[PDB]
Design an enzyme around this catalytic site. Sequence first.
Site, PDB file in Angstrom:
ATOM      1  N   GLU A 123       0.827  -1.207   0.000  1.00 34.10           N
ATOM      2  CA  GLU A 123       0.000   0.000   0.000  1.00 34.10           C
ATOM      3  C   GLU A 123       0.865   1.262   0.000  1.00 34.10           C
ATOM      4  O   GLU A 123       0.853   2.056   0.939  1.00 34.10           O
ATOM      5  CB  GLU A 123      -0.976   0.007   1.183  1.00 34.10           C
ATOM      6  CG  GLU A 123      -2.157  -0.936   1.046  1.00 34.10           C
ATOM      7  CD  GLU A 123      -3.253  -0.383   0.160  1.00 34.10           C
ATOM      8  OE1 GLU A 123      -3.078   0.727  -0.384  1.00 34.10           O
ATOM      9  OE2 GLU A 123      -4.294  -1.055   0.011  1.00 34.10           O
ATOM     10  N   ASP A 124       1.629   1.423  -1.077  1.00 34.63           N
ATOM     11  CA  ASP A 124       2.361   2.657  -1.350  1.00 34.63           C
ATOM     12  C   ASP A 124       3.356   2.991  -0.244  1.00 34.63           C
ATOM     13  O   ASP A 124       3.399   4.110   0.262  1.00 34.63           O
ATOM     14  CB  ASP A 124       1.395   3.822  -1.572  1.00 34.63           C
ATOM     15  CG  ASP A 124       0.957   3.950  -3.012  1.00 34.63           C
ATOM     16  OD1 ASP A 124       1.818   3.823  -3.908  1.00 34.63           O
ATOM     17  OD2 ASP A 124      -0.246   4.177  -3.248  1.00 34.63           O
ATOM     18  N   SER A 125       4.174   2.017   0.126  1.00 33.10           N
ATOM     19  CA  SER A 125       5.285   2.253   1.030  1.00 33.10           C
ATOM     20  C   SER A 125       6.589   1.869   0.350  1.00 33.10           C
ATOM     21  O   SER A 125       6.608   1.241  -0.710  1.00 33.10           O
ATOM     22  CB  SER A 125       5.115   1.488   2.343  1.00 33.10           C
ATOM     23  OG  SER A 125       4.293   2.213   3.235  1.00 33.10           O
TER      24      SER A 125
END
Lengths: 66, 44, 115, 528, 98, 34, 98, 521, 39, 255
Positions: free
Chosen positions: H204-206
Amino acid sequence: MIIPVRCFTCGKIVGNKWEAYLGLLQAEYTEGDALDALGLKRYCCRRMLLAHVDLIEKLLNYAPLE
Amino acid sequence: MIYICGECHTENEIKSRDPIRCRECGYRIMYKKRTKRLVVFDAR
Amino acid sequence: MNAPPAFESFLLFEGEKKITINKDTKVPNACLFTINKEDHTLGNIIKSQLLKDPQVLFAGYKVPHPLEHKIIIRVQTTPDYSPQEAFTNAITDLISELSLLEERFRVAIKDKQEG
Amino acid sequence: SLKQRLKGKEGRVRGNLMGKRVDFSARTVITPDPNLSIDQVGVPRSIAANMTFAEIVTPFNIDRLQELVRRGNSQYPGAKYIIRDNGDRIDLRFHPKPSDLHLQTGYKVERHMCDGDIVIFNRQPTLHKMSMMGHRVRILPWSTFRLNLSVTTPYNADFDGDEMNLHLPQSLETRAEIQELAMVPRMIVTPQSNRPVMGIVQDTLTAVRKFTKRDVFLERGEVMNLLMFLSTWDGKVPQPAILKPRPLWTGKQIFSLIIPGHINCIRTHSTHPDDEDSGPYKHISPGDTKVVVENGELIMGILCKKSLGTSAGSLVHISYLEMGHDITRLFYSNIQTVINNWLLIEGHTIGIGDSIADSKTYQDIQNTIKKAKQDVIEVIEKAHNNELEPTPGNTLRQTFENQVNRILNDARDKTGSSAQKSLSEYNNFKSMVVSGAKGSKINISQVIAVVGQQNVEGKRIPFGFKHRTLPHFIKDDYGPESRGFVENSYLAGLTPTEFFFHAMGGREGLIDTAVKTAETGYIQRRLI
Amino acid sequence: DGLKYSLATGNWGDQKKAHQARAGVSQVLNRLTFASTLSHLRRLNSPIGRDGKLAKPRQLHNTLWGMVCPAETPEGHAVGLVKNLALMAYISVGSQPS
Amino acid sequence: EITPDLWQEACWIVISSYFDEKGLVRQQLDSFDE
Amino acid sequence: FIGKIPIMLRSTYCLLNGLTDRDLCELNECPLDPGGYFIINGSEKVLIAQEKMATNTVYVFAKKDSKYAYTGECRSCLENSSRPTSTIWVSMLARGGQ
Amino acid sequence: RKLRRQMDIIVSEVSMIRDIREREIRIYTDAGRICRPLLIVEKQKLLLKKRHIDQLKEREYNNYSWQDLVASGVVEYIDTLEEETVMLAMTPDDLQEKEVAYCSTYTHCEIHPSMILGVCASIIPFPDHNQSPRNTYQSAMGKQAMGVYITNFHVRMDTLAHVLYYPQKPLVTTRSMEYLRFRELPAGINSIVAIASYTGYNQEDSVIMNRSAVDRGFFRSVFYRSYKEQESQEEVFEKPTRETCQGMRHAIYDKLDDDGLIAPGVRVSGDDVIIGKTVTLPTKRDCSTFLRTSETGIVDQVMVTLNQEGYKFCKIRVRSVRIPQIGDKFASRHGQKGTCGIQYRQEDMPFTCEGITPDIIINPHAIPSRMTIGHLIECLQGKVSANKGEIGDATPFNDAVNVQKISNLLSDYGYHLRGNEVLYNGFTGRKITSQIFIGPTYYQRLKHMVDDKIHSRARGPIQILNRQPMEGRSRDGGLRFGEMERDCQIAHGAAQFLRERLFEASDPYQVHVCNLCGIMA
Amino acid sequence: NVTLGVPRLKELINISKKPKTPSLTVFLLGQSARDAERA
Amino acid sequence: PYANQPTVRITELTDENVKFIIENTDLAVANSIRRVFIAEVPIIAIDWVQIDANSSVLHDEFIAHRLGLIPLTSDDIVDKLQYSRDCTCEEFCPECSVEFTLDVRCNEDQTRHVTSRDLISNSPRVIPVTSRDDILIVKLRKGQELRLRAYAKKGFGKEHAKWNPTAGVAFEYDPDNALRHTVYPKPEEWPKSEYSELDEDESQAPYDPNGKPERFYYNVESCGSLRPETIVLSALSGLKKKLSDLQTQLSHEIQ
RNA sequence: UUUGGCAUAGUUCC
Ligand SMILES: [Mg+2]
Ligand SMILES: [Zn+2]
Ligand SMILES: [Zn+2]
Ligand SMILES: [Zn+2]
């Protein structure tokens, strides 16, 4: 600002190669040939010299406080 | 107290309750001089 | 601000024990070893050496959290053999292999230079 | 004036009685942490040392509380205040005298927040009750709010600069309320649509499909590791499927150990055809679809979004309804840990090799596009020669536009189908689409074959200039290129007019996103 | 004082009548990056109310080809109402038609 | 005297000359000067 | 003397107009600074271009449900002398008369 | 038109429009019209010739320039409503040539169609392979990246300033960045990015960041903050004494000099005194300025002067180096934003056959739904450029740069043509079954850090009118418990928790009331 | 060709006497339902 | 249930490079040695800086950070030294640290390069590797000055990456994919490894179901601090001491 | 160990 001492990715010392790289370029070398001559073998090390922007030259223009 | 002038780079003594002027150049911006206290930096 | 100092990943502090031994009550002849301030560099060797033993039925390791430095090793062995003996034999065999490897590397260096 | 003081928002009633700023609250960035449980939250040591909870002294805990007071406000597992029975406060942030440190039952000690404390975690806006759930505190080194990944769906939270709020209940009564009412495992199935509100999210979900394929055979050491990551494991290694000439387990044989209790379920994979259920091989399923779980064992089938997802009757929903929150929590955690540590072996990626097609497919796509453009040209010629006849209930412009849009949509869909059916079994777009993790067949079609038509306010691109779309076209040009049909894919790139038309198309989406929010919030407030 | 105040606050008008004075002119220069500085110095503004739900002036008209950037715009309450010049765009300075 | 298929350098020579002559904030300076 | 007028940086009436990069460095000014902003009480201010409807042209629009069918306005100004605008409308009443 | 092209009577700024159908000629000398230059096509051939090109390419020591090009009648300024009577061609050598006749009456030509993009959108490489919302997001995030913002930052006392240690110019750059001077004052670093799902900390967008790379100066920066104070009774800069001044706090005054100012080079932790000022209460009141809580910086520079009126004036600057933690925000040039998830040392990151561990690992799930293929093409072109030695060209509309050509060029250096590379697991040493896509992409460190966003409260300061907690992280304020939150708690049914949040945790109070009249007594 | 979504929800919650797109679906009884003549 | 019998062969040995092949060893042991090369090999590096005067264009933390990354020759005295946390001195004594001094002023009209050539140590055996070009530290204008004192402790690469003694550790096993540890969607696009033993037509070796990874190929390149043979030997001894201390603690706990 | 407020602008997240 000024060329980093180590290559970020692997740690090979590239901080002693900027003057030699500029001299090789001034002596009519392509960038690939200069990087090959300096011993920069892998692209992680090569980008450290290819993408460097030397701003300390601009910063040296302004007179010091004292 | 010694302040360094921002134009002629000449340090001059200025005490409290004193207009901040520079001798021999007539400037109005003064910079404090670096402290003599020692501070330790890790090399990280 | 909340940055732990770098030395906390390999330095035991006041009170911490290096290794603690606990038994597993689910299955007979099972035991869990908890090692503080270690990582895969030791866990992997010990596991792979325990698996070579023909009297070891289970042998694994895990790091419960990457931000907390601790290694848990679980070994179950056949009866008439204890997991503590399996662990100690594994460490001894690893040390013997490393010593032999160092000797041979040193002789290979000697052969390579001036030879 | 006083009426202005009482009038609206920021006005006394609606801004200080129906909602007001509170104590014992914190807010910082959230980052992922797959090693936590469903109902756990990671808290930095600074926030915990700053927030306090008042614990009443009894003979059961007087020694522990006295040691906390001895540690004092400096050391983190300490305390900040001592509250006497009379109510007078004693400070502990500075150096106090030894007399006040005396503790007797009936006192109160305001210790720092520690592990196991119950807090309420929220992300604004708060739309449904699954946006304020109770979590258990765990203290972690750095300074972000670590939280699990299956809990992303209830909050609608991604980890790109987001923040969330922490509220710490201060009494045993409210702590027991939150523990028995609003804990995360107790809110797995929502009452809005009687479906599980949280499920596997896109990375365990893109990998459980690969794990549950037929080909996955696991070595003895890999089985040892994966079982080492199972928290609800009996302690007995199951017999391998393949026993000779080398012992090999299977991915289903370990997901069976993950699945709890005796759960009976029958789902269907997302690529299950329409002939297997009818013709022969109904119960043999050559492609390994038709998930079957009998007695808590994955007998057959491939697990995907339609089995582990947030839909009605899924495997997680059955697990909840049959076993309870306390076992569904372990179900989630075990699935995530086992699949992640196996994924450390298989790996996953996405690249140009996964976004590039074959020469035959390129020829097919170009042929289809040329045929569609020729058909549009023919329709325009018939309209100019007045030979086009209007459809009943429609104007001449309306029927011409309907025919043109229908032809172009057929072209786009046919090229999309060709691009889909020309994929490979190792393609990572297919991996992330079939398993339901993230993406869609339309996205694959736009990447490979054709971006498609751009529309403004539901119609084709309008005539902004005098009777033409751009200064690069002649006047009165109704071809596919003039009104904004992008023939190229994202891999080939867009010509400048298509670039500008695509920007015009995306502006509408940005505007709708920025517009709908306030009206939706106002509608929800009026209903409440 | 009039020029200094109007430039300092941004309320384009007299101080006594800063009610109907249009605020939002004369912002304080952005200095986070050189690109931020340049894109601040080359910036437009549509005085349409930022809360207006009718979003026809917020769209990307066909006539912005080569005059205004099709991409660079803020997101939120001012999407499509703050714009930036294209690279080679120029704005006339004025003359007299004698 | 046409410039055929050598255009990808001619256009950028022209654009470089434009930006050497004018700059990027010429509008503000010209407006205030006028 | 009737007052002091703020000066835009690098403009024709600034002290940095026409100077070379060496002189700019001597004055502790960045040679890369684009200029085009005012210095008001230390802070740096930037004027934002404000869109407005073109003047001295006849535009014919229509209103949704107003009394008139078609309207036409000519926002009129005189060479930036004074009297900013005077929007005269020439409307036409609808056909729905009672 | 002839007179305007000669530049004899009518300035080049004036526009002329002929409405052929409605029989009207409109000439505008107005100010505020927006216009852009265009090339002129006379019959079917550009009036721009090789002689013009040569005289331009000898621009130095020749006094031939853009004005001399305009005066020759070669280019022209076209405003918006003169563009409605013109026929444009996007590319000369492609649209003027003989074809199946579309238009044979072209009246102008575009210089280059990539000049339709603004300053911030001219830095995106391959913007025509992206999605329009992604281009918009990058246009937004280009104003937040940290690099050297101006060369004379050492004499500027700016309230907040952020400068990167080692900026690098992109290895894949647009042709129109030389005019934006992104080569001279860049903001970002070329990082070896691998697109893989490694340990689940990039979901999730890390972003997973190499900690050994960070220890070597990777994405490190400085933070400068300036404080000001003037002595406007009688405010005086002086060193206060505990047992002679009325107002006082729990801070340390031992850092100050005789006149009440800290000398540069003195490390000051949070909640210290920088400038000591005292008001003579009609016997002295302390109005000293304090560091914003929890800075832990070193005094960098102190400037003493006189303000407009004549009161003494002082500005003090404090610096603090910011090492990238696990909450900081990073983004590439394609609208892909994310926060650091966890940092691994070099021994733990996956490695290639040649010991090249990635600097950054990003999740593969960010690509399929966002359709930022410019990201992948930039990665491939950078992997080609770092080996070849050139700097790749990613100007938007080229037709001479294909993924196939890039892959063929890359295959000549010993790598897989499509960019993949066999990686080994870090912990176990075993090969990863799926080959990973890895190459040098140009990443940016956004302004949003976590040390400037973390905030907590437990019984702090309280407002005056309502006796509720203050507002603002700088004022140790609380978090608002809004109507949506209280509705959520109503839906939960936690009546006691709701009453605690709305009454006891916030302002509690007691009053007396008469049993006969409901009026406070 | 009707209104759906947020505007429709707004209209249904705050009922107005002048809906944006009023409609009236009509069903026929006998042979008018099948044969196009009486339809 | 016993140990292996590893064998080595050194293919190439120069002043900055060792290529060797380990055989008859388990993948876990080979990878543990590979990890120990990077992390746990003690090195001398600067870890304490006190700047007397810094009028240059780089701030004090910038200069100190650059100083930390200059490698110092610790070939022989890294074993003799003690950890500063393990020493009887108060802060620093010659038995646990090496002191450096830098004092440079520019009085000319030409830009002066302050390099690692100017770092001066008291012990003649710990000097920067560019002292038998030079690692640039900072450049000075006219009138600018730098002067400091620095102390070089002992540590390894787990703590900070300035004590990492290697440049790039190339590790590779099974160059031909005979064990199918990685699966190629198209095997013919992939360049053959340097150590491949195949013809020009065959791309992958035939599958070997009864095989395990053996014959690991290494290439340890040194960053100048240690010489690339002592990096390998210190890793074998360094890993061996970790296992021995584990056995000691286990024996106490069991009894 | 004590507490300023009004306005405007920009930015982050749905
Ligand atoms: Mg988000
Ligand atoms: Zn390198
Ligand atoms: Zn002076
Ligand atoms: Zn010592």
